[PDB]
Amino acid sequence: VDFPRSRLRFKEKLGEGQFGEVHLCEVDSPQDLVSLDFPLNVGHPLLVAVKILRPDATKNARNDFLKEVKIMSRLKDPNIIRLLGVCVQDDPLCMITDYMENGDLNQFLSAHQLEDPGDPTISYPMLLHVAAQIASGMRYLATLNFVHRDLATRNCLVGENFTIKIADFGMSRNLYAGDYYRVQGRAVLPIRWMAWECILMGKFTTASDVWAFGVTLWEVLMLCRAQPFGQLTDEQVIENAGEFFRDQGRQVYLSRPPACPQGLYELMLRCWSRESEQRPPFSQLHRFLAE
Numbered sequence: 424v425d426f427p428r429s430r431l432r433f434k435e436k437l438g439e440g441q442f443g444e445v446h447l448c449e450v451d452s453p454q455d456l457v458s459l460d461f462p463l464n465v466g467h468p469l470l471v472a473v474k475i476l477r478p479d480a481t482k483n484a485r486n487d488f489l490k491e492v493k494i495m496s497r498l499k500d501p502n503i504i505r506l507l508g509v510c511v512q513d514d515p516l517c518m519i520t521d522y523m524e525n526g527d528l529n530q531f532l533s534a535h536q537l538e539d540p541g542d543p544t545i546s547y548p549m550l551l552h553v554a555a556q557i558a559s560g561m562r563y564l565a566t567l568n569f570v571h572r573d574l575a576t577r578n579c580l581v582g583e584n585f586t587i588k589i590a591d592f593g594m595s596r597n598l599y600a601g602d603y604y605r606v607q608g609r610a611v612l613p614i615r616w617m618a619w620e621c622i623l624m625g626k627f628t629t630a631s632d633v634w635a636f637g638v639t640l641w642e643v644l645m646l647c648r649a650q651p652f653g654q655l656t657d658e659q660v661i662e663n664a665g666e667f668f669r670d671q672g673r674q675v676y677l678s679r680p681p682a683c684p685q686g687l688y689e690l691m692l693r694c695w696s697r698e699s700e701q702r703p704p705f706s707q708l709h710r711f712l713a714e
């Protein structure tokens with residue numbers, strides 16, 4: 424049974440995508456809608472984000488939208504985006520999720536400086552808290568044997584009090600076009616976040632998600648101040664994968680961020696182990712970061 428679409432009132436656009444755009448909507452007097460799937464605290468109207476399939480969508484776009492509903496219906500964790508409701512029995516097709524009022528994590532961290540017109544700062548423990556939450560969400564996806572394939576701060580959302588949820592906004596956003604390697608007729612690839620075996624073999628696993636987490640953790644500790652391997656070309660990043668394969672000590676790594684102690688950097692390096700099996704599981708990464 425659908426969420427009652429009439430209870431949504433459009434406020435503004437937040438973003439757009441390959442098979443739907445995301446609108447900020449208001450829900451008046453939401454108390455009668457509360458359920459195991461639809462939580463509420465309560466500025467008395469509830470704000471939600473709604474991804475909507477517009478009227479001129481291609482058949483291919485509609486199919487991808489309906490499959491995204493199915494994929495997201497799997498997701499049941501405090502640090503993963505969740506479907507509060509859907510409207511799919513008639514058009515327009517809608518996915519309803521929590522409004523994450525501080526937007527994507529990359530833009531959020533880019534707007535802060537590490538604790539030494541106001542001046543937004545973030546503390547080192549809070550950075551660790553951000554990182555721990557990402558690891559907790561990934562720990563959950565690992566239990567589902569669900570491979571994310573595009574973990575990065577651009578795909579994470581920030582709510583109140585530095586709460587984090589992992590999401591997936593796809594690979595077509597102009598804002599982050601430089602984070603993907605495009606060859607005509609091939610899958611688009613986030614190569615600067617990809618494990619060497621992914622670059623060479625095009626297959627993604629939980630272990631390559633762990634590598635991408637290492638790069639995401641590096642982003643967080645950089646406060647997103649620069650692109651991974653930013654002074655290298657896409658081609659050099661791809662060649663670096665070859666050097667991991669050959670294992671003659673000529674592969675290169677992301678450097679230690681200014682805000683990152685050597686002990687935490689050693690954890691990053693463990694995420695970038697040549698051998699998939701030597702990379703720490705997310706349960707271990709989460710324990711380290713939280714404790």
Ligand SMILES: O=C(Cc1cccc(C#Cc2cccnc2)c1)Nc1cccc(C(F)(F)F)c1
Pocket residue numbers: 437445472473474491494495498503504518519520521522523524526571580589590591592
């Ligand atoms: O995350 C999405 C896309 C999507 C769908 C519906 C709503 C929103 C939003 C939003 C928003 C934006 C700003 C502020 N507040 C909220 C985003 N898909 C998806 C597909 C497969 C796997 C995953 C997973 F595993 F990463 F969680 C996620």
